[PDB]
Amino acid sequence: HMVPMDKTLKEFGADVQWDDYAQLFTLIKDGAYVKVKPGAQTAIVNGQPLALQVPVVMKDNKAWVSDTFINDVFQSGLDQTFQVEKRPHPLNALTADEIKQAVEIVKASADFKPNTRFTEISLLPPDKEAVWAFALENKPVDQPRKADVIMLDGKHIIEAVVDLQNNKLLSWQPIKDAHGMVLLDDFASVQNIINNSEEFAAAVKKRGITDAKKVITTPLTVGYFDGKDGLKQDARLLKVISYLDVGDGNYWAHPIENLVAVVDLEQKKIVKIEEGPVVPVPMTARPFDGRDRVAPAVKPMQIIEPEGKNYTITGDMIHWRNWDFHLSMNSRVGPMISTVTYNDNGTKRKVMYEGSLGGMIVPYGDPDIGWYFKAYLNSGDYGMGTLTSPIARGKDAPSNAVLLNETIADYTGVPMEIPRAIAVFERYAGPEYKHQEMGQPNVSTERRELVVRWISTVGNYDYIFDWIFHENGTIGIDAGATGIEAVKGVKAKTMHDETAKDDTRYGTLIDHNIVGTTHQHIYNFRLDLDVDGENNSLVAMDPVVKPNTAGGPRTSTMQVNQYNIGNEQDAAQKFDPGTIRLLSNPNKENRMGNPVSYQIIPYAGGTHPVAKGAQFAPDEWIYHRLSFMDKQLWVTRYHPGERFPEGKYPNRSTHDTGLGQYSKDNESLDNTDAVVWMTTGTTHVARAEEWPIMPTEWVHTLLKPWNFFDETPTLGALKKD
Amino acid sequence: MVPMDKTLKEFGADVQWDDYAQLFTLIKDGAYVKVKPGAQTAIVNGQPLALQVPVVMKDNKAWVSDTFINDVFQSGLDQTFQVEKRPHPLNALTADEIKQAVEIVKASADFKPNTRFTEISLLPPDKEAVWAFALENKPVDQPRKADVIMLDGKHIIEAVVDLQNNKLLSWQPIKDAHGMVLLDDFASVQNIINNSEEFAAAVKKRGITDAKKVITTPLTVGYFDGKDGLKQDARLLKVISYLDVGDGNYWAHPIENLVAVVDLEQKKIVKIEEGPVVPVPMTARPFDGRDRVAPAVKPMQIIEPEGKNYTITGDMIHWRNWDFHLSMNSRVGPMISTVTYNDNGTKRKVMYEGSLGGMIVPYGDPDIGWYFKAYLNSGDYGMGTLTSPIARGKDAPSNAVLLNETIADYTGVPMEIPRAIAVFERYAGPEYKHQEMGQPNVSTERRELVVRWISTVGNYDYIFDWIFHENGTIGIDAGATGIEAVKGVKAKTMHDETAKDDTRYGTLIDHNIVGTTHQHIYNFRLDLDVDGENNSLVAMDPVVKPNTAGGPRTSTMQVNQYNIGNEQDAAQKFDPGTIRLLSNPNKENRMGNPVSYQIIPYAGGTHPVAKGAQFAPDEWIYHRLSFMDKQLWVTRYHPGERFPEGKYPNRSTHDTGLGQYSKDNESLDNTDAVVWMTTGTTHVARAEEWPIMPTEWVHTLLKPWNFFDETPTLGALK
Ligand SMILES: [Ca+2]
Ligand SMILES: [Ca+2]
Ligand SMILES: [Ca+2]
Ligand SMILES: [Ca+2]
Ligand SMILES: [Cu+2]
Ligand SMILES: [Cu+2]
């Protein structure tokens, strides 16, 4: 029997184009580009013919296909984009069965407790050396597949390690004073606790809210203030900021200002309610989904690759041109790019062992009750990988992208598949190079970049990260920010109102009674680069103007001050875009005797004002707890247990357990396994163009080969010799 | 009948045959055509077209009527280009006007026999009249006038012609001004070197056996208050030489420490400077792929089957809410004019005129063949004249529309530049997005319209992109590629004796070759008229201040806002951590905030950033080109102040550019301002950039700031 072609293909997620003049259907789904004419006994998949027992049937203007059409066509094998991995890569993320296995093991322990939750269940990484031997020498990793299982027992954190290969518990270690991150059920609990609160309902009523059932809460970490906030350091708490649901799908546009509840999660109750001046809730409808807008007409534009892609995805390994890397997912930080090599005329040279987002923070600068403690450590306290936002095909990624699914463990230990978790796409990026010598034939080649894109949404903000692989060896890392602004309710409608001046001291008036409170977006990337080997050194090249001592008319010259940076303490610094910072390999040189290196550029530009550091006085606790915010460049000695700029357990942390801690012993960085950390941020002063919803704003970072190669990397294969 | 492939390719269209669907897909600029063999009709940009003669297959070759191209491509179904019945007042001089202007000056008794023309361009009506035409269709009632700058030998003369009335209005010799380098000067230099026995003897000394393989390159000499020993009244050019070894890349074979000074009027070398002898680097280093084989790549296309979202009428481009005029100039290239943003049915002013103002590539080596090296690309060589035709699909994406532009050559004869500018729309990630937990996703794609121009001067090729975002932002990016200017040195590796001295002013990027450090400094002249003529420059500096509102916080994030009242204060360094707005103090958005545009001179770059001029304050290039040391400049609008480096920068003795335009320190309060953005890079070379450099980019941005009342891309309310 048969099924309706359009409805089915759409369900399946494929793009369907019908050409009435050619009597042809063009279907696109990831690596598959298909053409099929009604009644034809064959279809075309990526330029190759595929026989069809049951042809597409056109009946009274509707197309119908066999119930096996989707599988016969899309899983035929003519689309070679994906290939089966034969020997499992040691860095492959835990499978669904491994996740379940790890959970059964801890649950089999005499200490496991019933309400125990899982903040993170991830692969315990094999030793770096073996992983490289597997990637470069294909040597098997004879070390048991293990898993780190971080558990939250009520409010207590416990770390356990399970031996997946032998199915047994290796360690069970409680971690004192550590608080666990915010888990999904905490959101529902806060909403429910607020809904059952008699006092809160009364506080809300005096603030002009009739139906307390329309109040939407949002859970926020309280941070640490040495008690000045009057909060017990031992309790598992969350502060709650509320908004009113007016039915326009954007409760964020209706803040109930100056009302903050403090909820104790173990106690399941509001332990404190801070109330400030009453501010009338902004009620005007401000939808961002277009319900009240006209859909403008736009002509179609598609980027197509009719014969398939230039890259191949074997299991989780991606091969594209000279690049080879492994791509996996972690529930905390998202995507992890591993064992990155660049094939230099037959030899795979190491570039990066492991790269991923280290952590990020969005701190506010308003001192009022509903804002003084507001600082979001999105990955650390919320879990960005778990909050991945499925890619909206053709909108969040170009129409020629391939969308990957990724699996991780939810907070109850059950496997979870995030659909369209990461997008992979090749794109035209202008001329790779060009030279039009006068009177001679032109010379130009196009530039191609391979992009790996991932989006994660935490509350009101959506963040986009692109890991950009340039064909010429350069690696770009861009961070985009969009979503809905966290706003403050104010009495002024315009800057001509009496309280205007005071209402906008900490932010711009972006709408009537609405202020986009100033804040920063600070991202940090953990890049374990291994420049053509493990042992590297940090080198500084500062371009300078020096007096001319060679004679002739010039008074000055352009020279460079080159010097090594021998320790972690001196490597932690601000980044001057006018200078050059290299991670060199003092053991290997290019054809000219120069050390093979990678130039590190933590600041390659951005569309919002740039954050010069943390916009906090040096005596602020957030400033003290999180030193990674104030420096753009950090370099530490490799250690398998140092992966977060903000530290492993940042919720209500009392001291820097991150980059401040990783560099405190000021170790030597001379000819050793170094790990680069790049911090780049923006200082967001709002404007009306960003409300009700903000247009994506981007920040760029870059890693460029510096004398890593001996000539223009994309000139091509040498014809003679 | 006539062969399709042959005819179509000669026409410049792309031909795709699909055997499975028996369909030909033909593409050229905005025309996207589909035609099946034997079919009585074809499709042009999604619309049906009756064919007089069906396409016919003859021995597996398709044939079409001799009128096919005309009936199909010029059918009228391709609406990309529309007829302009009332010519915009900024339209560039046409070929007929150029020839007419030239005949008017030649009819004068003051015209001399071998006079050349450095520039023949339109002399535009007053700004007011042009805006009135763009916004109210009011006719500019002033005859078309042309500025005709002549070079008589070495003497510059400025004339003005009235094109309507066909008469000469003025003829004014310009005292002390030196003319820009003209194309015939290139041949004279090479020829003068060829006929120089002294020179050939110097070349022989340096190991060159065949003086006929010597390639000269002409360079302006700058000004050193006589320290260079050159006469200020003489039209001179210095010459740097290379050896042609047959690899198509003479740049890779410098003849170091040999410089000749040529007097163009005397037509002879007037001075030869000789430094240490350095063997010419000889190894073949082609950049054209003659010695290479590219890896096979699966095909990729960017299709727009229904045609483009933009329309081109004359030179007026309309796309989404934008409207602007695109014209060409021989000195600075493209001019973006009368830019308005259609805000819910009402066209609001954004920019009267924007274009590259000028640029410079100053070097940092003091030696004989480098100390005076400073390329004023547009000003001394003419970037519009040297435009490099776009290589379809490579220099610009495959869905681009390539425009042809016309200018006058140095002899006054119209010169049409094929594929002079590329226009193309491109996907640029999500316009905005919000995925509220457990709710339907909301995302829209971002589209950017790019206007791309490429200019090549000697060894460097420069790419300029004028980017219009749907949300009102305007981006201006400049890319740099080409062949690096290298110095011949004795060291082959950093392990050789002279290596350290050889690399004191640049990196050793190849054996015996050092890419001498230098900077790339661009300056954009943007006569922004934010929602009107009268604007003011406002500074917003984000700062950390002590908390005085109570609570646990010790500090707060606040803004220090203040106006910049004069030209002198407006000439400043740009801190990317601060905000700079060109605001209209007479109009406000719904929230009572002054409608403005945020000026960002530095939005990013792939090469190290130039924080200013890498020259001591007493260097002559420094004193002559003040624009190199400040990233932001704002001056009072004046019709004859268009170049950051001065109108006549060749051997200029002082700043006639931005230093002169702002010298008077005028008021910038509620008045017609002109913004100048200087953005540069400091280039310290690497091996990855030789023999040909991968394109490096810099970005600048102009963002609407409380210009609108909400997200500009949500759409009109139902
Ligand atoms: Ca350390
Ligand atoms: Ca490393
Ligand atoms: Ca203006
Ligand atoms: Ca002035
Ligand atoms: Cu923000
Ligand atoms: Cu350069």
Secondary-structure map with pairings?
Two copies of one chain form a homodimer.
Chain A (H helix, E strand, L loop, with lengths): L1 E3 H8 L2 E5 L4 E6 L2 E5 L5 E4 L2 E4 L5 E3 L2 E5 L2 H6 L7 E2 L12 H12 L9 E8 L3 H10 L8 E8 L2 E8 L4 E8 L8 H12 L2 H8 L9 E6 L16 E8 L10 E10 L4 E7 L26 E3 L6 E4 L2 E4 L2 E8 L3 E11 L2 E17 L11 E2 L1 H5 L19 E8 L5 E21 L7 E16 L2 E10 L4 E9 L3 E3 L10 H4 L3 E5 L2 E4 L1 E11 L5 E13 L8 E9 L3 H4 L8 E10 L5 E7 L19 H5 L7 E5 L21 H5 L8 E13 L9 E13 L10 E2 L3
Parallel strand pairs in A: 9-19
Antiparallel strand pairs in A: 1-8, 2-3, 3-4, 4-5, 5-6, 7-8, 10-11, 11-12, 12-13, 14-15, 15-16, 16-17, 19-20, 20-21, 21-22, 22-23, 23-24, 23-33, 25-26, 26-27, 27-28, 28-29, 29-40, 30-32, 31-32, 33-39, 34-35, 34-36, 34-39, 36-37, 37-40, 38-39
The complex binds calcium ion (4 copies) and copper (II) ion (2 copies).
